[PDB]
Amino acid sequence: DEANIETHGMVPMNRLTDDPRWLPAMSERVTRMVQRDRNHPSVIIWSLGNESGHGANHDALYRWIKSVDPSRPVQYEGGGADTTATDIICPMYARVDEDQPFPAVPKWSIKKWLSLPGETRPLILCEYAHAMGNSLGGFAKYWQAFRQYPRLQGGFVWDWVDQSLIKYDENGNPWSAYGGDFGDTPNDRQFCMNGLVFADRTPH
Amino acid sequence: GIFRDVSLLHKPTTQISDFHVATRFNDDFSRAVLEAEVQMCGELRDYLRVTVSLWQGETQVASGTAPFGGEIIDERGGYADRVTLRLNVENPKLWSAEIPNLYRAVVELHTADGTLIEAEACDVGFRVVRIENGLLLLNGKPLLIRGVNRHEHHPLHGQVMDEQTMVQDILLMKQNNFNAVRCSHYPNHPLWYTLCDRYGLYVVDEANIETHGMVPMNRLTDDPRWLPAMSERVTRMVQRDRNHPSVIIWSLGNESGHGANHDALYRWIKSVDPSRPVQYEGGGADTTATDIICPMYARVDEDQPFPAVPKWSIKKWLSLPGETRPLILCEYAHAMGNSLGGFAKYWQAFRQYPRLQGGFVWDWVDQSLIKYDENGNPWSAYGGDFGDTPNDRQFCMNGLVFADRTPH
Ligand code: NA
Ligand code: NA
Ligand code: NA
Ligand code: NA
Q1: How far apart are alpha carbons B21 and B38 in whole angstroms?
Q2: Under what conditions is it induced (chain B)?
Q3: Helix/strand/coil for B386
């Protein structure tokens, strides 16, 4: 269960989440989620949101959750996927064997990530195996790793269903549309369609 | 046989009986303290003095003089027959396999009025070896062990070692980008360590304990009746070799399972010499008797799940729940004949993974022996060629170089 906090477009990504003036707003999105959903057994992990960097507000709200509901781990990928605001190493699109050494937020090989000095947490990818169109090449490598490594406990494929929308031709025929087909500009054309199933839930 | 040197040593009645050198550093290795503990035997007298002088070539960099009598250590007092000199060295030249900077420590037992009774001496290398946050550090930097296992073997003289062969080996090793050697599986000829101090090789000094043939392998090492014997092999090694800077790691032996005697002697080493990590591969390579995960022939990516002593993939091994130690293979890349296939995979892993800090190839030199044909021609022989039976025919030849030190 994930709080409705994403500030991906900020520069830097944590401009708001490191700002105490936005701590109230963020808090409401976390606290009110927990207060609503904490009795559901299906919810096994709390998430502080997505792609909002790593700021002190995350640390604060992490600790708040841990204090009010210690029955569930808290995870958060922002700020390098292994910050103090997560109980689980939860990277996005970390590869099995290939390192991606980005400045300040590297995406290590998940195998390597587990063994970094001082690292003891489990590793569950919050996003992997980007199913954009004709994709999921190399999925078996992930699952071989998951089964071989105890602390590689899986991940969440990105993603379930294409976010396409239905438009209608001049002849009334429906067709599937993506970014830019509604005059929306700027837009990220077909990156809305990353699903294992079509929007009508027909499988890829 | 008597396969190492035999000597006579004449000492005075009042003599230096033991001396240990330790080096302590500040956070950036700009300041060092050489702590020299000197012990005497014979008649104590208030005019006796110990002077410890430290030299860089012909330059005296530090010195210290003191009468005997150490500090109070328990309710009965201190050691009247010991003294610890603490010498300060500013901006010491640090010892490493890359730059084997050495000082000369001279320990003079003399009188107050200046008469020299005797003098002992050692080469001193200023370096710190410690495991920090899962990494083996030398002088604050993580090591990458380009190591090889080396038996003391000569095709003509067997297990008799000479200086010339040692030097030949060290030169070849350094010329082939080795920086470390494992004394497989026993303390080496003394000179070895000196040469490694001088030329710059990291040394794993290994107690002469291997019980591989026992069933189970720890039948003796788990038996307290064999704890004395084992102890002598460990303790007397440390007491002999603890002043050599080249020795960076102690090993409790090889292929003797995991028994309580190992735990005891591990702790003994850690108590007497906390300046060096202790490793031991037996009992699964990750037991309580080792500071370093030191498997034999663990593969890079392939698991070998043996009962009770699995050989995990080294990458996987690092990440097992609760595991934080560095991983240095005590033996890998078995160079038996036409071999070393897949070596690059090991080195890719070593460079990618911080806590994979290398290993020791098995091994340096083929253990072949020279026999002679009917026509007087020499040929290289292996197990079974001397009527020895049972024998392990050619498994004695696992070297990167031939017995004559010609490279494979
Ligand atoms: Na797993
Ligand atoms: Na998308
Ligand atoms: Na490494
Ligand atoms: Na062999």
Answers
A1: 9
A2: By allolactose.
A3: coil
If asked whether residues B119 and B146 sit together in one domain, one would say no
Residue A199 to residues A101, A166, A171, B16, B42: CA-CA distances in angstroms?
35, 9, 22, 87, 94
CA separation for the pair B53, B104 (Å, rounded): 8
| Same domain, yes or no: B56 and B205 | no
Cβ-Cβ contacts under 8 Å for A187 (sequence gap 6 or more) = A179, A180
CB contact under 8 A, A148 and B313: yes
Residues of chain A with C-beta less than 8 angstroms from the C-beta of B133: 117-118
Residue B316: which of A99, A118, A149 has the nearest Cβ? A149
Which of the residues A2, A77, A119, A127 is marked catalytic?
Answer: A127
Whole-angstrom Cα distance, residue B293 to residue B320?
A: 12
Q: For residue A178, give the ligand nearest its CA.
A: 2
Closest CA of chain A from B333, distance in Å: 22
Q: Collect all residues of chain A within an 8 Å Cβ-Cβ radius of residue B298.
A: none
CA distance B144 to chain A (A): 15
Q: Of B254, B183, B156, give the one whose Cα is nearest residue B212.
A: B254
Distance in angstroms (rounded) separating the CA atoms of residues B324 and B357? 13
Distance CA A30, CA A48 (A): 7
DSSP-derived pairing of the beta strands A165-168 and B180-182: unpaired
Note whether B157 and B214 are same-domain residues: yes
Residue A150 touches chain B, beta carbons under 8 Å = yes
Q: Which of A111, A112, A117 is nearest residue B133 as measured by Cβ atoms? A: A117
The question of whether A170 is a catalytic residue gets the answer no
B90 is catalytic: no
Instruction: Judge whether B320 is closer than 8 Å to chain A, CB to CB.
Output: yes
Residues B182 and B60 placed together within one structural domain of the fold: no
**Total number of domains in chain A:** 1
| Method by which the coordinates were obtained | cryo-EM
Question: Quick check: B137 contacting A, CB < 8 Å?
Answer: no
CA of A161 to the centre of ligand 3 (A): 41
**Alpha-carbon B203 to chain mean position:** 4
Cα A17 from Cα A24, distance rounded (Å): 10
Q: Can you tell me whether residue A99 is helix, strand or coil?
A: coil
Looking at the structure, tell me whether residues B98 and B49 fall in a common domain. yes
> Does residue B72 sit in the same domain as residue B111?
yes
- In angstroms, the CA B222 to CA B51 distance is 45
Resolution of the PDB structure in angstroms: 1.8
* A32: closest CA of chain B, how far (Å): 35
One domain for residues B79 and B222: no
Strand partners, B106: B53, B121
User: Which chain residues have CB less than 5 Å from ligand 4, an ion?
Assistant: B 395, 398
Q: List the single residue in A with minimal CA-CA distance to B349.
A: A112
Backbone phi, then psi, for B92, in 5-degree steps? -60, 145
Task: State whether residue A28 sits within 8 Å of chain B by CB.
Answer: no
Burial zone of A169 (CB within 10 Å; 0-12 exposed, 13-18 middle, 19+ buried): exposed
Query: Tokens 């090449």, residue?
Result: A137
Question: Containing domain of residue B37, as a range?
Answer: 13-127
What are the structure tokens assigned to B38, written together? Answer: 């000197």
Same domain, B408 and B307: yes
Q: Which of B303, B318, B322 sits opposite A115 (nearest CB)?
A: B318
Q: Which among B287, B291, B283, B349 has a CA at the least distance from the CA of B130?
A: B291
